[PDB]
Symmetry: C3
Subunit: 114 residues, 3 copies
């Protein structure tokens, strides 16, 4: 799986260890091997949520399977929790787009997962 967070929070406010924490927490939530998990954090962005530039985040989680109604609610609680605790972003100023990818549409190591 791949998790991306884009935020207007400045780089200095992203605490040490954040990428590792995301990796560990996502491995456990998705059930996928930790070696599979990619994480990407993009601070200092020019963004607004509801017209306001108070701290906010726009995120995505791509996975081959492990995406669905109940699973996505669980991921959102986990991820909003982390963004609130670590980046001080209110959960109501976070969007997360979930993508269930077909194995044939994910390239890795010169080939695909298909």
């Amino acid at each position: 799986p791949m998790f991306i967070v884009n935020t207007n929070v400045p780089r200095a406010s992203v605490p040490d260890g954040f990428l590792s924490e995301l990796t560990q927490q996502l491995a456990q939530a998705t059930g996928k091997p930790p070696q599979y998990i990619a994480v990407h954090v993009v601070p200092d962005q020019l963004m607004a949520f509801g017209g306001s530039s108070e701290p906010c985040a726009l995120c995505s989680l791509h996975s081959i399977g492990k995406i669905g109604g109940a699973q996505n609610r669980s991921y959102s609680k986990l991820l909003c929790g982390l963004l609130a605790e670590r980046l001080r972003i209110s959960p109501d100023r976070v969007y997360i787009n979930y993508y269930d990818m077909n194995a044939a549409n994910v390239g890795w190591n010169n080939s695909t997962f298909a």
Copy 2:
């Protein structure tokens, strides 16, 4: 709705009020409340369009519904118009990917919209 613009135009060339104008115009266009609209502008990017690095933009609009043939043509006219007027980007150097998101696949506020 979430709207993202990635561009090679420099930050100083993004005028005051641009995020607010996008928020307002997208609210009117999508029929969604502005409180729900997120906008994200990413200037100073290393990009090429059609084999040149003249001003260009790669964008996305995600919405739960309000996506379709005629609607997307209307959004493109609106958004290319704004990018041309405000960022001086030629409409023929803009791509906008449209995504009709299922409510279960959009996380917000510790849950999803499902």
Copy 3:
């Protein structure tokens, strides 16, 4: 079509002419004219792959058609090859998401491709 590469490798390590090389190689691979190919490279990113901050890349290729099982395997070999040779990123630390876009969902030049 549109190709995006996000990577932790430094900007200075991206060779002069890399964008043009991607443009031409993708034109040949997809059979699409170079005038329609957009490329976007984002260096110096805060990212991890398998919990490791060694060089890695997260990429996407969007195309109207020319996406599928065999084609994506071929694109993956091509693109991992280029990232390895030019950016010194190991293929086993690259993900590429493939998207077959409907023409109605791709905006361009005040309209869509539909």
